[PDB]
Automatic annotation (TrEMBL), chain A:
The keyword Ribonucleoprotein applies. The chain holds residues 78 to 176 of 188 of the full protein. The gene is MRPS28. GO terms for biological process: mitochondrial translation. It comes from the Eukaryota. This is 28S ribosomal protein S28, mitochondrial. It comes from Sus scrofa (Pig). Keywords: Ribonucleoprotein, Ribosomal protein. GO terms for cellular component: mitochondrial small ribosomal subunit.
TrEMBL record, chain B:
Residues 44-58 have a biased composition (Basic residues). The chain holds residues 60 to 117 of 118 of the full protein. GO terms for biological process: mitochondrial translation. The keyword Transmembrane does not apply. Residues 34-58 are annotated as: Disordered. GO terms for cellular component: mitochondrial ribosome. The keyword Metal-binding applies. This is Coiled-coil-helix-coiled-coil-helix domain containing 1. The gene is CHCHD1. Keywords: Disulfide bond, Metal-binding.
Length: 99, 58
């Protein structure tokens, strides 16, 4: 039986370090007319817009490349006891995954 | 001597300005509500804020 502490040490999330400026691949699980809901393995799902080039091949289950900036968008405003989360993540599109 | 026998050029422009001002005044109200100048109307912002309210208590 592997102790839980050992699992965190070798987990890919811990090996990433800071989430800012990290090249992480993700998979699309929901498609709107202009918004691509991408899951990159983090806690939440980042949202990006379809690029004007090769936009027809961004379908469900397609793998894309992301540049994570904040793992979870969250800020504190005055008069708020607890921070108001956005339940999303911030990322940008660098293209499609090169199979 | 208050005769428009030679003021025709000025009289027409005064009518043109009145029509021009009338057109802009009777159309500004309707379009400005949804034009939004790039910023959402007050009704949309109120709904957006209600989805992510502020927490003074607890």
């Amino acid at each position: 039986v592997e102790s839980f502490a050992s699992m965190l040490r070798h987990s890919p999330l811990t090996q990433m370090g800071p989430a800012k400026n990290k090249l992480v691949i993700g998979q699309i699980f929901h498609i709107v007319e202009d918004d691509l809901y991408i899951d990159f393995g983090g806690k939440f799902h980042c949202v990006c817009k379809r690029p004007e080039v090769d936009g027809e091949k961004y379908q469900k289950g397609t793998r894309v490349r992301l540049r994570l900036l904040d793992l979870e968008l969250t800020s504190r405003f005055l008069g708020a006891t607890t921070d108001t989360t956005i339940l999303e993540a911030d990322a940008v599109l660098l293209g499609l995954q090169e199979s | 001597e208050f005769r428009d026998e030679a003021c025709r050029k000025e009289i027409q422009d005064f009518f043109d300005c009145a029509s021009r001002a009338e057109a802009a005044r009777k159309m500004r109200s309707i379009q400005e509500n949804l034009g939004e100048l790039g910023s959402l109307p007050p009704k949309k912002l109120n709904k957006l804020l209600h989805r992510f309210p502020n927490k003074p208590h607890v």
